[PDB]
Amino acid sequence: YEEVARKLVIIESDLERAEERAELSEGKCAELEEELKTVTNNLKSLEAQA
Amino acid sequence: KLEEAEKAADESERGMKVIESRAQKDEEKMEIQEIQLKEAKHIAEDADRK
């Protein structure tokens, strides 16, 4: 139980960090998506301007 | 012969008291060890379930 539950905790601690990486990377994905949309909206405003 | 027969009864009865008190101690200990075995096994089963 401790070997498997400790694997559950290790895998879960890696999971929390992988999930944290999913949240940090999703944070960046959303930030880059906001920047992408800001830059793409600027691109479209600048296509219209160009 | 009455003293021998009664003494055989009295001594076998004392024999019996010691080994009945032993049967009682062994019985209480086996019930305790059986309940503790059931619980140590139930903890093992609970730990196996866990």
Backbone angle region of A15, left / alpha / beta, with phi > 0 → left and psi within -120 to 50 → alpha: alpha
| Residue B50 to chain A, least CA–CA distance (Å) | 6
Identity of residue B45: E
CB proximity list for B50: less than 8 A, separation 6 or greater = A1, A5
- Experimental approach: cryo-EM
| Residue A4 to chain B, least CA–CA distance (Å) | 10
Outline where DSSP puts E strands in chain A.
Answer: none
Please provide the distance, in angstroms rounded to a whole number, between the alpha carbons at the two ends of chain B: 68
The tokens describing B26, both together, are 């062994």
CA A30, CA A25: separation in Å to the nearest integer? 8
Contact B50, A5 (CB under 8 A): yes
Resolution (A): 10.2
Of all residues in chain B, the one with the smallest CA distance to A5 is B50
